[PDB]
Design an enzyme around this catalytic site. Structure first.
Site, mmCIF file in Angstrom:
data_model
loop_
_atom_site.group_PDB
_atom_site.id
_atom_site.type_symbol
_atom_site.label_atom_id
_atom_site.label_comp_id
_atom_site.label_asym_id
_atom_site.label_seq_id
_atom_site.Cartn_x
_atom_site.Cartn_y
_atom_site.Cartn_z
ATOM 1 N N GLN A 69 0.791 -1.222 0.000
ATOM 2 C CA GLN A 69 0.000 0.000 0.000
ATOM 3 C C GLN A 69 0.827 1.277 0.000
ATOM 4 O O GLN A 69 0.293 2.334 -0.352
ATOM 5 C CB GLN A 69 -0.940 0.029 1.215
ATOM 6 C CG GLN A 69 -1.986 -1.072 1.233
ATOM 7 C CD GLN A 69 -3.111 -0.777 2.204
ATOM 8 O OE1 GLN A 69 -3.513 0.373 2.372
ATOM 9 N NE2 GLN A 69 -3.627 -1.816 2.851
ATOM 10 N N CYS B 34 -6.405 -1.539 1.160
ATOM 11 C CA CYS B 34 -6.272 -2.974 0.921
ATOM 12 C C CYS B 34 -7.265 -3.462 -0.122
ATOM 13 O O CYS B 34 -7.003 -4.456 -0.809
ATOM 14 C CB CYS B 34 -6.468 -3.762 2.216
ATOM 15 S SG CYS B 34 -8.130 -3.686 2.944
ATOM 16 N N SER C 30 -12.601 1.172 2.300
ATOM 17 C CA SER C 30 -13.587 1.054 1.232
ATOM 18 C C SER C 30 -14.663 0.058 1.643
ATOM 19 O O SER C 30 -14.451 -0.789 2.513
ATOM 20 C CB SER C 30 -12.935 0.619 -0.086
ATOM 21 O OG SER C 30 -13.909 0.342 -1.078
ATOM 22 N N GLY D 139 -12.170 -3.957 9.398
ATOM 23 C CA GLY D 139 -12.187 -4.867 8.278
ATOM 24 C C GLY D 139 -10.916 -4.822 7.454
ATOM 25 O O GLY D 139 -10.140 -3.872 7.515
ATOM 26 N N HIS D 140 -10.720 -5.879 6.669
ATOM 27 C CA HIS D 140 -9.557 -6.012 5.809
ATOM 28 C C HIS D 140 -9.959 -6.798 4.572
ATOM 29 O O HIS D 140 -10.803 -7.694 4.637
ATOM 30 C CB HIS D 140 -8.399 -6.712 6.528
ATOM 31 C CG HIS D 140 -7.101 -6.645 5.789
ATOM 32 N ND1 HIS D 140 -6.546 -5.458 5.362
ATOM 33 C CD2 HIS D 140 -6.253 -7.623 5.390
ATOM 34 C CE1 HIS D 140 -5.408 -5.706 4.739
ATOM 35 N NE2 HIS D 140 -5.209 -7.012 4.739
ATOM 36 N N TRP E 129 -2.224 -11.133 2.114
ATOM 37 C CA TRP E 129 -2.847 -10.034 2.842
ATOM 38 C C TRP E 129 -2.642 -8.678 2.180
ATOM 39 O O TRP E 129 -3.272 -7.703 2.604
ATOM 40 C CB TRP E 129 -2.310 -9.986 4.276
ATOM 41 C CG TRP E 129 -2.514 -11.257 5.046
ATOM 42 C CD1 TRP E 129 -1.568 -12.191 5.353
ATOM 43 C CD2 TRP E 129 -3.744 -11.731 5.605
ATOM 44 N NE1 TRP E 129 -2.133 -13.218 6.072
ATOM 45 C CE2 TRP E 129 -3.468 -12.960 6.239
ATOM 46 C CE3 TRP E 129 -5.051 -11.237 5.632
ATOM 47 C CZ2 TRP E 129 -4.452 -13.700 6.891
ATOM 48 C CZ3 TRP E 129 -6.026 -11.972 6.279
ATOM 49 C CH2 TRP E 129 -5.722 -13.190 6.900
HETATM 50 N N1 LIG Z 1 -6.316 -1.031 4.017
HETATM 51 C C1 LIG Z 1 -7.337 -0.919 4.490
HETATM 52 C C2 LIG Z 1 -8.690 -0.769 5.165
HETATM 53 C C3 LIG Z 1 -8.386 -0.593 6.647
HETATM 54 C C4 LIG Z 1 -9.445 0.232 7.372
HETATM 55 C C5 LIG Z 1 -9.466 1.613 7.240
HETATM 56 C C6 LIG Z 1 -10.434 2.353 7.906
HETATM 57 C C7 LIG Z 1 -11.372 1.705 8.701
HETATM 58 C C8 LIG Z 1 -11.345 0.321 8.829
HETATM 59 N N2 LIG Z 1 -12.325 -0.364 9.659
HETATM 60 S S1 LIG Z 1 -13.817 -0.321 9.263
HETATM 61 O O1 LIG Z 1 -14.188 0.209 10.579
HETATM 62 F F1 LIG Z 1 -14.294 0.881 8.296
HETATM 63 N N3 LIG Z 1 -14.677 -1.804 9.264
HETATM 64 C C9 LIG Z 1 -15.658 -2.182 10.380
HETATM 65 C C10 LIG Z 1 -17.110 -2.372 9.940
HETATM 66 C C11 LIG Z 1 -17.200 -3.169 8.734
HETATM 67 C C12 LIG Z 1 -18.658 -3.393 8.336
HETATM 68 N N4 LIG Z 1 -19.719 -3.194 9.308
HETATM 69 O O2 LIG Z 1 -18.919 -3.733 7.232
HETATM 70 C C13 LIG Z 1 -16.492 -2.532 7.647
HETATM 71 C C14 LIG Z 1 -15.000 -2.513 7.951
HETATM 72 C C15 LIG Z 1 -10.381 -0.417 8.164
HETATM 73 N N5 LIG Z 1 -9.505 -1.959 4.974
HETATM 74 C C16 LIG Z 1 -10.897 -1.842 4.546
HETATM 75 O O3 LIG Z 1 -11.249 -0.890 3.940
HETATM 76 O O4 LIG Z 1 -11.822 -2.847 4.863
HETATM 77 C C17 LIG Z 1 -12.681 -3.199 3.811
HETATM 78 C C18 LIG Z 1 -13.863 -4.000 4.374
HETATM 79 C C19 LIG Z 1 -15.158 -3.527 4.226
HETATM 80 C C20 LIG Z 1 -16.227 -4.251 4.731
HETATM 81 C C21 LIG Z 1 -16.001 -5.449 5.393
HETATM 82 C C22 LIG Z 1 -14.705 -5.923 5.542
HETATM 83 C C23 LIG Z 1 -13.639 -5.200 5.034
#
Ligand SMILES: N#C[C@H](Cc1cccc(N=[S@@](=O)(F)N2CCC(C(N)=O)CC2)c1)NC(=O)OCc1ccccc1
EC number: 3.4.22.10
Length: 247
Positions: free
Chosen positions: A17, A47, A137, A194-195, A212
């Protein structure tokens, strides 16, 4: 379950990244209050964009983009002044996949560095990336749309949610893609958030090889309900995937 050696490793694909992958991402403009400053630095590619770009490099596709994309940054973002709009002229892109190298260690030409930074920024804009020192995202729902409409991948691209299947049927979807030489986009949520990452292998005993997107850190074999990389300190909830990714 079939045994499939890691598809990305077989092609030397290892993206990250930071530099030089993020040389065309937006430059951070503000200091999040009380936090150490990242102003003047390019935002992380995210990611979601790194996992997608690794899959796109595996297919070396497309040679030409299909449609532009625009969106407005979330007003919640403390790293940029608002309103902030971002635009990617994807429909005019001539992606030279011989300049988009499988991995970068800094020794590469600036033509090659700008080639991967072009893709990383185009992919990130295509998925409404919330840019920052870490970039987030929505993930699967926008990845499936962007791969089809903006980059012209096959109609077979679609998102599948873990809650819609048994464990056996869910793993059967992943196993079918890998046996078709098609890596799988994957994402999950843990306590820290999330990741998004890539599944590209299977040991034949319900362990799957994970990339990853951190430049190789913690890559290895994991179970689908135990996606706990050591670099964290797992992404086992709200799991979703994008399958059928091919030209
Ligand atoms: N590099 C990089 C980023 C790292 C990052 C940056 C800022 C916030 C964050 N944490 S989040 O709080 F926003 N989170 C919690 C709630 C979840 C939900 N309720 O859907 C969404 C995911 C994580 N990774 C990514 O963007 O995760 C994509 C993703 C989206 C949906 C599900 C799984 C993964």
């Amino acid at each position: 379950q079939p045994v499939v050696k890691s598809l990305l490793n077989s092609k030397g694909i290892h993206y990250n990244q930071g530099n030089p992958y993020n040389l065309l991402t937006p430059v951070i403009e503000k200091v999040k209050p009380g936090e150490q400053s990242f102003v003047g630095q390019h935002a992380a590619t995210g990611c979601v964009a790194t996992a997608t770009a690794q899959i796109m490099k595996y297919h070396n596709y497309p040679n030409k983009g299909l449609k532009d994309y625009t969106y407005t940054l979330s007003s919640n973002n403390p790293y940029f002044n608002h309103p902030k709009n971002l635009f990617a002229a994807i429909s005019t892109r001539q992606y030279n996949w011989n300049n988009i190298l499988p991995t970068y260690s800094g020794r590469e030409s600036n033509v090659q560095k700008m080639a991967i930074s072009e893709l990383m920024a185009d992919v990130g804009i295509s998925v409404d990336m919330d840019y920052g020192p870490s970039s987030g995202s929505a993930g699967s729902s926008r990845v499936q749309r962007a791969l089809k409409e903006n980059f012209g991948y096959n109609q077979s691209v679609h998102q599948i949610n873990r809650s819609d299947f048994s464990k056996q049927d869910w793993e059967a979807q992943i196993d079918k893609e890998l046996s078709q030489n098609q890596p799988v986009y994957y994402q999950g949520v843990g306590k820290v958030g999330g990741h998004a990452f890539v599944i590209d292998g299977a040991d034949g005993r319900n362990f799957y090889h994970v990339n990853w997107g951190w430049g190789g850190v913690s890559d290895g074999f994991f179970r689908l309900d135990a996606l706990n990389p050591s670099a964290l300190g797992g992404f086992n909830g709200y799991q979703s995937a994008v399958v059928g990714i091919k030209p």
